[PDB]
């Protein structure tokens, strides 16, 4: 058995081993700095440290079983996985974090749990869990805000523990800056100990500063160092939230810049008010219906195989209903749906009138068109989603009475999303299929004998 | 010493710039401290004098034995000879600032006494500090850590200058006169640095100013502290927005592709294949496409980056062995990079053949068994298959057998139309290619 | 009657339903936590709650009879509108917003308006009104600072009500952190209560913290949570205002970047000072006359039908004054004005000199040119708006004594805006028009035998 | 009749000379209206400066009623049409409202209330025009953005200082702990103490620091909460403007550093050899250090075709006229050929063209020192310098030539060069309008081949 690192079992393992790392950091620094809850609940921290050590042994023997991509394929040799695990420094950090340092409890009396600070070396696993969760989830900005709240909570708790350890080293209640005298039964409770030291670090690290002032030089130096660390950390968090917000509204900024540039251009060139109202309603439709991206730019970087699968998974059921593309080759149909290009029409906009130059084959997708008459609007046939027109104008049969003059008056009923297939893209895709090109020519010739 | 220092791939020059940076930072730090604070007492003056002699000896050694010997580029070619290097340093603008920095105003120690205000010309050698900072930004792997380090260093220097000016204001208003000034209880520089931090970070909790000079000082110091805190926040914002830009651009384009596929209701197998391609592309290249990077590079570096990757691999192909090297260079420039998922058919049996594939970082398998699943040969990285399809036209040759990808194979695809559009320039190589097509077909 | 969401009537209803939702949020948390507004103005809040419920059932009926978009057409059958409204979670949120929880007033004696907290669930109408106003209005940055001040004033008001509720739970006047004893006639007034709670929450959330320090564990924990919330609020405010300032001066930043890049190129290639100040004065004109963006880049994001309609509505009314294009066909006119190119000429620049190859045909739109005589200030004919030149040399009619050479020197008096119609552009627009190409050629042969 | 050009230097000097007293009127009219000891003590100075401001205001009306405006690209010089175009403008209504003679009421109140002179503040658009023209005129745009931000928040902080002193004068002096102290004490009653302590109060309020005494009254509480919301908005726009200044400062360096990081990621991907890796890195560091890092086809893309052609003339025409085959050709052909010239840069050690290569390019040397060497390595024959050229023969394609469009030389770049490349296809695309010059170029190349080898 070899666990795939890109699978779901490995991510569930990342959660089940990134819980005791956060446990080890948070509760080991409070157990080492307070010594009031370590002396109260010894069995609970013994059971939780035994479970964290069992999870760390399982972490070593699972991290020694994860595969890695060597030349595109997942390697499965366990000796190669064990040697690739041995040659890197994360095995050194794991074997340094899995030293049995708990045998020193027999010498110290188990009242000093700061000997378990070797177990804080597995922080790359927790950072890997945070990176994999913000990769996997669909709310990356909300997970980044939650991760920044968790980072400032870790830093607040570690600073509160550091302030209580410094207050224990100096002496409780001897000064005005330190934590007060714990022989008084009000300040001697563990709850007010932790919550007031958390309040002091909340006031200090966020650069508010309404604590009692330092009266000695060690307290002055610690408050200067602590204000400097707090202003650098909280300027980093405010810059991170600012960069995240400026990345969140960047698409709205770019779309509003495009709308304002087009509106300033049409205010400069004196375009009429009905056409301006039409194009502003078109951009409002384009924004409110979330079609602001375009196919030609969102399918730019993808390869032709995945673009072919995306194109045949939408267009092939409509192109196989087309009469002239009924019995052609599957690679020709893949290239034909690759050559399709989308066009969006407003309601009331004419697709083509009588006598215009016909060189595009329109394929209707999520829209409704109709062939109107010359003067008035009467509905001869209403073409629905999955219908098509424009095959004669792109076949251009020699000996035709049409003369590349696609017939009728086609206008849009609603907001249509037409996929056009031009003459140049058809003759570009039809170079490598000569007998299929000849079959298209005789199919158009039979259409010509049907249309006299 | 060598006759010429390269100053780009030389670590000894970076060590010397670190030494002159330590000298200049010693001047800019310990000149206001000795100017304001009473640490320059009559039994400690010899230590400051030995440090000042070592500092001026470092400055004079830099002006006399190192800065003439820097290599430079005039007219395109690198200059080597020491006479022209010395004349380039002498007619430079760094020599004017150096010779204005090393004016011996310490001769006036005999007239006016030991005063560190006369050494204020030594802080004009900031070009060595900026050159060392630019060299360390260019020689470090990740620049955001050094931008945070430089911002922290400028913040600590501004707070040190503010502590010195606050101790000067305390000496000007008298020590312990009002409640605003420094009182004299503990360490002078430590409590003045505490006042400078709590003022110029705009925190508060200090004693209020009493008279007009103290209120003007507190107003100007709090306004400068507001602007320093704003510059620190904007600097960290610019550093984070420059660091995460490629990751945010890749995530925005992947979100655009996922939103388009969910707008068109594309099913979960094709969506999983698109997300798998985007995940492996981010894990492999750390960028979407390389053609939009390479199309902004100039033609000679495009030529060299094409040659050192693929020129030997195309030179092992027996088809283009007799053609021209410039035609081979043009098909080096017009190669297209694709990444094929595992289990994907690159050339189905019976399908039209129009491409020549070069496999790099991957393994493909030719499925030519009786049932259609028995592998014949595993073409590893650096192989070239499908080279015979570049000469037939129209229908021509069909693909003989199914070939699938074993793992994440990054094929290099050359089309037939791009080969013909290259071949409209080279008629003799086109004649060689069509006569090779006639003798092989 | 079926309303459509893009109309003005739906936006007027969005205003009329975004009034009582904001009322419900603000004054329901105020009346829930203060207990003197509900005691004093009982009939006023009963009338306003009844009017909010009348607007809520009218909003339920409007969202029951609102239109959506399928196949580009506005859906008009109210049974399908009712099914599409009832199948989603907004109908569940409206029904949960209209549970009769006001029948507990006869149970508790009406002094508890906290049972109307289900009325806050209709927040999508307020967010939709904010998004539609940001789409509609022409001051997006001023509306964004108005939305930001309204959001942080809602949070400041909610935090003031939470602080007064916590002080009412703990006790009035028992500590230094809590609100004082309300039996004193100075601290007992409702205006003093609300404005001091607002001042407390502004000092807390606006990271200034001058409030007297906490005494007990609940007060310490609430101040820790409240200061961390204020740190996140300050980060959000700084990020939105910084991204808005970047969006406000991004156009000036990119034009300054292009100006300094062209200036760096001009001092890199060592151009003459007269050409450098000509480029500098042209960029000063291009910024002072708001012609910054380039029109071929502006007209790229639009579709082909709106591009052809805008190209007609700008260029065709000046193109039809050209006498060689009097009787051409409409599609030739459409692709002719689509393949036009506008340029702006500085004063003193020669458009075409005598003896140069005539490859472009220029028509004047909002300009004044003059035909000078051989590098002199003397002008023969001063051209004006609506005129043309360059039709003699573009067609290459056989029998030409000129031979494709512009025969006159033309200087620009002021800033002109010509339309550079190229020979290659006219030839590419004349591919699908062979009979109109021969008609243009015989018209040019007739006018060539007329003039020369 | 004299007409001042609005895009000239005299109009900008007038913008400075009229943006001084508007800014004076803002500062000292709100300070004289609120403090009431400046107006009592410096009466002669304020009457003289207000008379000078009114003289500058009527001269501003006389200048803005004579400045021109662009129609049809032409600067109109007809003063009657200029007066009509100014008369149909709302800025004329703002100016005639700004020059209402309120000195009758100002002497009726005893030359002691300058609150009546708040009509003079209506020329804010003139000061905004001055700041716009200075931020597009000066050479320090980021430093002027910082100075304009400092000046705007100084205007707001001074107005808040005047508002706080007016609120303290309305409520009472020393009746609370929040207000300004009792002015009967001669230390707290000095005018400098008044202005400096009120300015310090409004700075501590509007920058959200808070060392002020806490308010007592409800109106004081409401003014402090409104002033703290305005102050957190002011701190937000200060941090936003300084962050935008830093980003606009180092945007080009960050874009180049992201380009170098992308090139390093590509070279770590494709396993490029380390000698070529450090060659590309040293090449791009040279291109950044001598400020040519942006491609000139992307630099000159925003320029129109006439200015692009004139820049191409003024750079490349005096170098293209020195070429032997383009010595006697037409001016329009030379303008098209200097428009069609593309630049390429090289690094040391690279080959321009080798022996037996298909010659399709004509290289013109600029800022470089090439050398023609043999096949075995560095054996220099003739060091080629700046201004020279090669490849003018093999792109002409003379029929019957014994070389057959080859190179017959190995040309290396000793230092970094900046060559100019003229392709064969670009020469044929520029020679399609001059067939007589095409046959003349074939005749000159046939002459060169006849004197060399045939
Ligand atoms: N003329 C015509 N075209 C129709 C009709 N019904 C569907 N169509 C399609 O409508 C078309 C629009 O123009 P085309 O020239 O492409 O070809 C025509 C047909 O394919 C009909 O009744 N008449
Ligand atoms: N069928 C086949 N092709 C091979 C083998 N080894 C290398 N190749 C190449 O693999 C190919 C894949 O594409 P082609 O079908 O055109 O042509 C085939 C050969 O050129 C092999 O053992 N069998
Ligand atoms: N040759 C010539 N052209 C004139 C005259 N008056 C106006 N024009 C226009 O000036 C022109 C310059 O360009 P064209 O050769 O294209 O065509 C010419 C005419 O349209 C005139 O007297 N002679
Ligand atoms: N063959 C040759 N070319 C030279 C010499 N000196 C300068 N050049 C130029 O170097 C060239 C390089 O190749 P070209 O084919 O363009 O033409 C040649 C000449 O223009 C020389 O001594 N021999
Ligand atoms: C704390 O209080 C106890 C008794 O209240 C006292 O004995 C002890 O000295 C105090 N601690 C200090 C540091 O003063
Ligand atoms: C508030 O005041 C009243 C009367 O003045 C008193 O009875 C009450 O005890 C006071 N509250 C507290 C908490 O002391
Ligand atoms: C101000 O001081 C004077 C004398 O010092 C005193 O008479 C007067 O009442 C004081 N006014 C106030 C408002 O305190």
Contact call for A303 and B338, based on CB within 8 A: yes
Is the shortest distance between the CB of C381 and ligand 3 below 6 Å? yes
Residues 6+ apart with CB under 8 A from B343: B404, B405
C382 membership: H or E segment, kind and range: strand C379-382
Chain A interface includes B354 (CB < 8 A): yes
In this structure, what token pair is assigned to residue D236? Answer: 């937000």
Among C71, C305, C331, whose Cβ lies nearest the Cβ of A366?
C71
In this structure, what token pair is assigned to residue D74? Answer: 């032409």
Q: What is the DSSP letter of A383?
A: E
CA distances from C301 to A252, C340, D416 (A): 15, 17, 41
CB pairs under 8 A between C and D: 151
The sign one gets for the Cα dihedral D303, D305, D310, D316 is positive
User: In this structure, which residue's CA is closest to atom 4 in ligand 5?
Assistant: A183
In this structure, what token pair is assigned to residue A123? Answer: 């922080």
The sign one gets for the Cα dihedral C68, C71, C72, C73 is negative
CA distances from B158 to A414, B134, B155 (A): 65, 21, 5
CA distances from D56 to A236, C267, D6, D85, D120 (A): 50, 40, 18, 22, 12
Question: Quick one: A183 exposed, middle or buried, by C-beta within 10 A (0-12, 13-18, 19+)?
Answer: exposed
CA distance C269 to chain B (A): 14
Helix (H, G, I), strand (E, B) or coil at D383: strand
Within-domain flag for A82: yes
For residues B337 and B290, the answer to whether their CB atoms sit within 8 Å is yes
Residue A417 with chain C: CB contacts under 8 Å: 72
CA distance B290 to A147: 32
Query: Ligand 2 mean position to C150 CA, how many Å?
Result: 70
Q: What is the domain count for chain D?
A: 3
Is the shortest distance between the CB of C407 and ligand 3 below 6 Å? yes
For residues C350 and C374, the answer to whether their CB atoms sit within 8 Å is no
For residues D406 and D313, the answer to whether their CB atoms sit within 8 Å is no
For residues B34 and B40, the answer to whether their CB atoms sit within 8 Å is yes
For residues D427 and D349, the answer to whether their CB atoms sit within 8 Å is no
CA distance B229 to B201: 6
Residue C451 counted as an annotated binding residue: yes
Residue A431 counted as an annotated binding residue: no
Contact call for C250 and A245, based on CB within 8 A: no
The sign one gets for the Cα dihedral C21, C24, C30, C33 is negative
Pair (D357, D400) in one structural domain: yes
For residues B146 and B140, the answer to whether their CB atoms sit within 8 Å is yes
Query: Ligand 6 mean position to C178 CA, how many Å?
Result: 14
CA distance A335 to A320: 13
Is the shortest distance between the CB of A373 and ligand 1 below 6 Å? no
Closest CA to A390 of A415, A367, A414, A371: A371
Residues 6+ apart with CB under 8 A from D96: D61
CA distance C152 to C206: 10
For residues D454 and D400, the answer to whether their CB atoms sit within 8 Å is yes
Helix (H, G, I), strand (E, B) or coil at D117: coil
CATH code (residue D425):
2.60.120.10
For residues A240 and B240, the answer to whether their CB atoms sit within 8 Å is yes
Its domain, for residue D53, covers 1-137
Helix (H, G, I), strand (E, B) or coil at C412: strand
Q: Give the CB-side neighbour count of residue D378, counting CA atoms within 13 A.
A: 6
Pair (D265, D315) in one structural domain: no
CA B301 to chain centre: 19
Indicate the residue among A136, A166, A186 that finishes a domain. Answer: A136
For residues A370 and A312, the answer to whether their CB atoms sit within 8 Å is no
User: In this structure, which residue's CA is closest to atom 10 in ligand 6?
Assistant: C181
Within-domain flag for C185: no
Contact call for B242 and D272, based on CB within 8 A: no
For residues A437 and A392, the answer to whether their CB atoms sit within 8 Å is no
Within-domain flag for A33: yes
Closest CA to B264 of B254, B253, B256: B256
Closest CA to D87 of D61, D105, D120, D112: D61
Contact call for A243 and B241, based on CB within 8 A: yes
For residues B85 and B112, the answer to whether their CB atoms sit within 8 Å is no
Pair (D280, D411) in one structural domain: no
Neighbours of C200 (CB within 10 A): 23
Question: Quick one: D367 exposed, middle or buried, by C-beta within 10 A (0-12, 13-18, 19+)?
Answer: middle
Among A191, A278, A355, whose Cβ lies nearest the Cβ of C217?
A191
Within-domain flag for C391: yes
User: 3-state SS string over chain B?
Assistant: CCCCECCCCCHHHHHHHHHHHHHHHHHHHHHHHHHHCCCCCCCCHHHHHHHHHHHHHHHHHHHHHHHHHECCEECCEECCCHHHHHHHHHCCCHHHHHHHHCCCHHHHHHHHCCCHHHHHHHHHCCHHHHHHHHHHHHHCCCHHHHHHHHHHHHHHHHHHHHHHHHHHHHHHHCCCCCCCCCCCCCCHHHHHHHHHHHHHCCCCCCCCCCCHHHHHHHHHHHHHHHHHHHHHHHHHHHHHHHHCHHHHHHHHHHHHHHHHHHHCCCCHHHHHHHHHHHHHHHHHCCCCCCHHHHCCCCHHHHHHHHHHHHHHHHHCCCCCCCCCHHHHHHHHHCCEECCECCCCEEECCCCECCEEEEEECCCEEEECCCCCCCEEEEECCCCEECHHHHCCCCCCCECCCEEEECCCEEEEEEEHHHHHHHHCCCHHHHHHHHHHHHHHC
Among D239, D252, D302, whose Cβ lies nearest the Cβ of C242?
D239
Question: Rg of chain D's alpha carbons, rounded to an integer?
Answer: 36
Q: At what angle do helices C78-86 and C42-64 cross, to 10 degrees?
A: 120
Residue C294 with chain D: CB contacts under 8 Å: 302
In this structure, what token pair is assigned to residue C410? Answer: 């033309």
Is the shortest distance between the CB of C183 and ligand 6 below 6 Å? yes
CA distance A413 to C75: 13
Neighbours of C212 (CB within 10 A): 12
CA distance C236 to chain A (A): 7
Chain A interface includes B194 (CB < 8 A): yes
CA distance C70 to A368: 10
Helix (H, G, I), strand (E, B) or coil at A205: helix
Pair (D374, D290) in one structural domain: no
Contact call for C368 and D225, based on CB within 8 A: no
A176, A181, A182, A184, best to mutate for ligand 5 pocket (most atoms within 8 Å of CB): A181
Pair (A3, A130) in one structural domain: yes
Most distant CA atoms of chain A, gap in Å: 111
Cα A356–Cα A359–Cα A361 angle in degrees, nearest 5: 110
Residues 6+ apart with CB under 8 A from D47: D111
Contact call for D263 and B297, based on CB within 8 A: yes
In this structure, what token pair is assigned to residue D128? Answer: 């905004």
CA distance C195 to C163: 12
Neighbours of C131 (CB within 10 A): 14
Pair (A414, A329) in one structural domain: yes
Q: Give the CB-side neighbour count of residue C249, counting CA atoms within 13 A.
A: 21
Q: Give the CB-side neighbour count of residue C153, counting CA atoms within 13 A.
A: 15
Residue where the block lists tokens 């979670």: C89
Indicate the residue among C136, C159, C175 that finishes a domain. Answer: C136
Helix (H, G, I), strand (E, B) or coil at A395: helix
Closest CA to C200 of C215, C213, C218, C183: C213
Pair (D423, D310) in one structural domain: yes
Within-domain flag for A301: no
- Domains observed in chain B: 1-139 (no CATH), 246-288 (no CATH), 316-440 (2.60.120.10)
In this structure, what token pair is assigned to residue C160? Answer: 């003031």
Residue D392 counted as an annotated binding residue: yes
- Listing DSSP states for A222-250 in one string gives HHHHHHHHHHHHHHHHHHHHHHHHHHHTH
Within-domain flag for A146: no
Closest CA to D363 of D350, D375, D379: D350
CA distance B404 to C182: 82
User: In this structure, which residue's CA is closest to atom 5 in ligand 1?
Assistant: A381
Neighbours of C317 (CB within 10 A): 11
For residues B403 and B385, the answer to whether their CB atoms sit within 8 Å is yes
In this structure, what token pair is assigned to residue D278? Answer: 């450090």
C360 membership: H or E segment, kind and range: strand C360-364
Chain A interface includes B217 (CB < 8 A): no
Closest residue on chain C to B234 (Cα)? C242
For residues B189 and B163, the answer to whether their CB atoms sit within 8 Å is yes
CA distance C335 to chain B (A): 29
Residue D391 counted as an annotated binding residue: yes
Per the rule left: phi > 0, alpha: psi between -120 and 50, beta: everything else, B43 is alpha
CA distance B420 to B430: 9
Closest CA to D114 of D61, D55, D42: D42
Chain B interface includes D358 (CB < 8 A): yes
CA distance A360 to B312: 45
Contact call for B187 and A251, based on CB within 8 A: no
C37 membership: H or E segment, kind and range: helix C37-40
CA distance D130 to chain B (A): 25
What CA dihedral angle connects A401, A406, A409 and A410, to 10 degrees? 150
CA distance A7 to A74: 12
CA distance A404 to C432: 9
Is the shortest distance between the CB of C173 and ligand 6 below 6 Å? yes
For residues D236 and C241, the answer to whether their CB atoms sit within 8 Å is yes
- What sections of D138-250 are H helices per DSSP? 141-171, 191-206, 218-249
Within-domain flag for D175: no
Question: Rg of chain C's alpha carbons, rounded to an integer?
Answer: 36
Is the shortest distance between the CB of A381 and ligand 1 below 6 Å? yes
Contact call for B277 and A306, based on CB within 8 A: yes
Q: What is the DSSP letter of A79?
A: H
What are B47's strand-pairing partners? none
Within-domain flag for C11: yes
Indicate the residue among A92, A107, A136 that finishes a domain. Answer: A136
Q: How many residues does chain D have?
A: 454
CA distance C440 to C395: 8
Is the shortest distance between the CB of C372 and ligand 3 below 6 Å? no
Q: Give the CB-side neighbour count of residue C3, counting CA atoms within 13 A.
A: 17
For residues B192 and B164, the answer to whether their CB atoms sit within 8 Å is yes
The sign one gets for the Cα dihedral D128, D129, D133, D134 is negative
Closest CA to A356 of A391, A423, A401, A404: A404
**Backbone breaks in chain B after residues (C–N over 2.5 Å):** none
Contact call for D332 and C357, based on CB within 8 A: yes
User: In this structure, which residue's CA is closest to atom 5 in ligand 6?
Assistant: C183
D174, D177, D180, D184, best to mutate for ligand 7 pocket (most atoms within 8 Å of CB): D184
In this structure, what token pair is assigned to residue B438? Answer: 């006639």
CA D53 to chain centre: 32
A352 membership: H or E segment, kind and range: strand A350-352
- What sections of D290-423 are H helices per DSSP? 296-299, 305-320, 331-339
Helix (H, G, I), strand (E, B) or coil at D28: helix
For B1-6, the CB contacts below 8 A with 24+ separation are B1/B65, B1/B66, B1/B69, B2/B69, B3/B69, B3/B80, B3/B82, B4/B69, B4/B71, B4/B80, B4/B82, B4/B85, B5/B66, B5/B69, B5/B70, B5/B71, B6/B71
CA distance B109 to chain C (A): 48
What are A383's strand-pairing partners? A369
CA distance A154 to A151: 5
Residue D394 counted as an annotated binding residue: yes
Pair (D261, D353) in one structural domain: no
Residue where the block lists tokens 């040391």: D348
State the chains in contact with D (3 or more Cβ–Cβ pairs under 8 Å).
Answer: B, C
Pair (C329, C441) in one structural domain: yes
Per the rule left: phi > 0, alpha: psi between -120 and 50, beta: everything else, C411 is beta
Resolution in A: 3.5
Is the shortest distance between the CB of B368 and ligand 2 below 6 Å? yes
CA distance C27 to A152: 34
CA distance C390 to C410: 11
Q: Beta C369-372 vs C409-412: how paired, if at all?
A: antiparallel
Residues 6+ apart with CB under 8 A from D371: D380, D381, D382, D383, D384, D411, D412, D413, D414
CB pairs under 8 A between B and C: 3
CA distance A432 to A427: 10
Closest CA to A110 of A169, A29, A49, A39: A39
Residue D229 with chain C: CB contacts under 8 Å: 149, 152-153, 202, 206
CA distance A247 to A257: 15
In this structure, what token pair is assigned to residue A391? Answer: 């095959």
CA distance A8 to chain C (A): 30
Chain B interface includes A306 (CB < 8 A): yes
Q: How many residues does chain C have?
A: 452
Closest residue on chain A to C221 (Cα)? A195
Pair (C282, C391) in one structural domain: no
Q: What is the DSSP letter of D398?
A: -
Pair (C281, C342) in one structural domain: no
Among C258, C359, C368, whose Cβ lies nearest the Cβ of D72?
C368
Closest CA to A394 of A314, A342, A330, A322: A322
Question: Quick one: D114 exposed, middle or buried, by C-beta within 10 A (0-12, 13-18, 19+)?
Answer: buried
Q: Which bound ligand lies closest to the C-alpha atom of C185? A: 6
The sign one gets for the Cα dihedral C45, C46, C50, C56 is positive
Q: Beta D361-364 vs D351-353: how paired, if at all?
A: unpaired
Chain B interface includes C238 (CB < 8 A): yes
In this structure, what token pair is assigned to residue C49? Answer: 């709650």
Among C73, C238, C293, whose Cβ lies nearest the Cβ of A242?
C238
Pair (C263, C329) in one structural domain: no
Question: Quick one: A377 exposed, middle or buried, by C-beta within 10 A (0-12, 13-18, 19+)?
Answer: exposed
Question: Quick one: B194 exposed, middle or buried, by C-beta within 10 A (0-12, 13-18, 19+)?
Answer: buried
What CA dihedral angle connects C18, C20, C26 and C27, to 10 degrees? 170
Closest CA to C409 of C363, C348, C365, C319: C348
B contact residues 227-286, partner C, Cβ 8 Å cutoff: 233-234, 237
C128 membership: H or E segment, kind and range: helix C124-136
Cα A54–Cα A55–Cα A61 angle in degrees, nearest 5: 95
Neighbours of D39 (CB within 10 A): 19
């Amino acid at each position: 058995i070899v666990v795939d690192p890109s699978s779901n079992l490995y991510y569930r393992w990342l959660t089940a081993i990134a819980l005791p790392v956060f446990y080890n950091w948070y509760l080991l620094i409070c157990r080492a700095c307070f010594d009031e809850l370590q002396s109260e609940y010894l069995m609970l921290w013994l059971v939780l440290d035994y479970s964290a050590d069992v999870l760390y042994v399982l972490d070593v023997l699972v991290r020694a079983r994860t595969g890695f991509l060597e030349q595109g394929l997942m390697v499965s040799d366990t000796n190669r996985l064990w040697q690739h695990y041995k040659t890197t420094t994360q095995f050194k950090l794991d074997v340094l974090s899995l030293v049995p340092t708990d045998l020193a409890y027999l010498k110290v009396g188990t009242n000093y749990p700061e000997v378990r600070f070797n177990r804080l070396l597995k922080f790359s696993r927790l950072f890997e869990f945070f990176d994999r969760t913000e990769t996997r989830t669909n709310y990356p900005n909300m997970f980044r805000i939650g991760n920044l709240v968790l980072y400032i909570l870790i830093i607040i708790h570690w600073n509160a523990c550091i302030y209580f350890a410094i207050s224990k080293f100096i002496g409780f209640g001897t000064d005005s800056w330190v934590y007060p005298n714990i022989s008084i039964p009000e300040h001697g409770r563990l709850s007010r100990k932790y919550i007031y030291s958390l309040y002091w670090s909340t006031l200090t690290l966020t650069t508010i500063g309404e604590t009692p002032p330092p009266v000695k030089d060690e307290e002055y130096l610690f408050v200067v160092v602590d204000f400097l660390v707090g202003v650098l950390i909280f300027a980093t968090i405010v810059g991170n939230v600012g960069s995240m917000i400026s990345n969140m509204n960047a698409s709205r900024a770019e779309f509003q810049a495009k709308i304002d540039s087009i509106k300033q251009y049409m205010q400069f060139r004196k375009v009429t008010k009905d056409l301006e109202t039409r194009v502003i309603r078109w951009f409002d439709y384009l924004w409110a219906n979330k079609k602001t991206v375009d196919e030609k730019e969102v399918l730019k970087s993808l390869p032709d195989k995945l673009k072919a699968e995306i194109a045949i998974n939408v267009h092939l059921d409509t192109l196989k209903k087309v009469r002239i593309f009924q019995d052609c080759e599957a690679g020709l149909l893949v290239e034909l749906v690759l050559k399709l290009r989308p066009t969006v029409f407003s309601p009331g906009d004419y697709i083509c009138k009588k006598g215009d130059i016909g060189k595009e084959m329109y394929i209707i997708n999520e829209g409704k068109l109709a062939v109107v008459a010359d003067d008035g609007v009467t509905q001869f046939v209403v073409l629905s989603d999955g219908s098509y027109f424009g095959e004669i104008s792109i076949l251009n049969i020699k000996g035709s009475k049409s003369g590349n003059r696609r017939t009728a008056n086609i206008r849009s009923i609603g907001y249509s999303d037409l996929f056009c297939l031009s003459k140049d893209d058809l003759m570009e895709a039809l170079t490598e299929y000569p007998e299929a090109k000849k079959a298209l020519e005789e199919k158009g010739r039979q259409i010509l004998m049907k249309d006299n | 010493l060598p006759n010429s220092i390269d100053s780009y791939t030389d670590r000894l020059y970076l060590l010397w710039l670190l030494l002159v940076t330590l000298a200049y930072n010693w001047n800019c730090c310990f000149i206001p401290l000795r100017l304001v604070f009473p640490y320059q007492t009559a039994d400690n003056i010899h230590y400051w004098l030995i440090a000042d002699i070592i500092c001026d000896i470092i400055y004079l050694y830099d002006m006399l034995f190192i800065q003439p010997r820097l290599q430079f580029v005039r007219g395109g070619d690198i200059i080597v000879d020491s006479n022209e290097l010395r004349k380039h340093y002498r007619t430079s603008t760094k020599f004017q600032l150096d010779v204005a920095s090393i004016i011996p105003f310490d001769i006036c120690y005999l007239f006016f006494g030991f005063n560190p205000m006369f050494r204020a010309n030594r802080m004009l050698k900031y070009t060595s500090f900026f050159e060392f900072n630019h060299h360390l930004e260019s020689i470090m792997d990740k620049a955001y850590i050094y931008r945070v380090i430089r911002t922290t260093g400028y913040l600590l220097f501004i707070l040190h200058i503010n502590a010195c000016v606050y101790y000067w204001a305390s000496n000007y208003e008298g020590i312990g006169t009002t409640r605003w000034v420094y009182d004299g209880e503990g360490n002078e520089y430590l409590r003045c640095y505490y006042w400078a931090v709590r003022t110029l970070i705009t925190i508060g909790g200090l004693p209020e100013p009493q008279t007009l000079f103290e209120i003007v000082f507190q107003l100007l110091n709090f306004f400068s502290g507001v602007f320093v805190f704003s510059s620190l926040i904007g600097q960290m914002r610019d550093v984070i927005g420059a660091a995460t830009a490629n990751q945010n651009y890749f995530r925005a384009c992947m979100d655009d592709t996922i939103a388009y596929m969910n707008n068109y209701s594309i099913p979960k197998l094709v969506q999983k294949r698109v997300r798998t391609w985007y995940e492996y592309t981010w894990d492999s290249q750390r960028m979407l496409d390389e053609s939009d990077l390479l199309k902004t590079l100039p033609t000679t570096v495009q030529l060299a980056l094409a040659i050192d990757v693929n020129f030997s691999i195309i030179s092992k192909v027996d088809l283009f062995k007799g053609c021209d090297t410039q035609m081979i260079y043009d098909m080096l420039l017009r190669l297209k990079s694709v990444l094929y998922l595992p289990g994907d058919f690159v050339c189905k049996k019976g399908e039209i053949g129009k491409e020549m594939y070069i496999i790099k970082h991957g393994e493909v398998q030719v499925l030519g068994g009786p049932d259609g699943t028995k592998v014949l040969v595993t073409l590893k990285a650096g192989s070239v298959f499908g080279e015979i399809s570049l000469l037939a036209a129209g229908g021509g040759n069909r693909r003989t057998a199914n070939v699938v990808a074993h793992g994440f194979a990054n094929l290099l695809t050359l089309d037939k139309k791009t080969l013909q559009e290259i071949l409209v320039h080279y008629p003799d190589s086109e004649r060689i290619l069509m006569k090779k097509a006639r003798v092989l077909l």
